[model samples]
Target: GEPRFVEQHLCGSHLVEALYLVCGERGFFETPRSEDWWRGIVEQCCTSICSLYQLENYCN
Candidate 1:
């Protein structure tokens, strides 16, 4: 099968914008400190789960 769903919003300026859109609404941007902290947190967490953990092939 061909790749039907490629990630289009997780890299470059798009990534920053996506992070801003999510965190900005939660008022992280307004706080500045947590805003920067949370962006990295979300990115790291997603990377760990989405890019590392594969239950079907690695965990199971």
Candidate 2:
């Protein structure tokens, strides 16, 4: 699969780090949540970022 612009701009480590930082600042992880719950948040963020860049092939 071809890489999306989001992948080029934000590597996995960078994205994870950024998410963690934001979540930490917002106290998102203060409450215990299921793994799926956290997964959904991360996926939503990725989807929004891809959409913002107008990259439709990101899911491949």
Candidate 3:
């Protein structure tokens, strides 16, 4: 079977956006630090998980 790479990518982006929204509403994005700092944190976590998923898909 083939993996739904495009669908997975879209889901990943949605997950990232949801995380950002959660952080914003929870005040995590209101710290004195730059917004990019929080954004990087969110992206890094999502990217890592996404990379792992891609690797597993490729391996299968």
Top-scoring candidate (lDDT): 2
Regions of model 3 farther than 4 Å from truth:
1-13, 20-24, 32-39, 50-60
lDDT of 1 by residue, 9-37 (tens): 24556445545444443544454455765
Instruction: Show pairs that collide, candidate 1.
Output: none
* Per-residue lDDT over 1-60 for candidate 3, one digit per residue giving the tens place of the 0 to 100 score: 444222333245665564444334345434465677646544544544343344333223
Which is better, 2 or 3, measured by TM-score? 2
Weakest lDDT window of 10 consecutive positions for candidate 2 = 51-60
Model 2 spans > 4 angstroms off:
1-11, 47-60
- Candidate rank order under TM-score: 2, 1, 3
Better of 1 and 3 by lDDT: 3
Please, what are the lDDT tens digits per residue for candidate 2 over residues 1-60?
Answer: 433334433336655665454344345555676888656545655543433233222221
Q: Give the TM-score of candidate 1.
A: 0.34
Scanning candidate 3 in windows of ten residues, the lowest lDDT window is 1-10
lDDT of 2 at 9: 33
Error of 3 at 13 (Å): 4.2
TM-score, cand. 3: 0.28
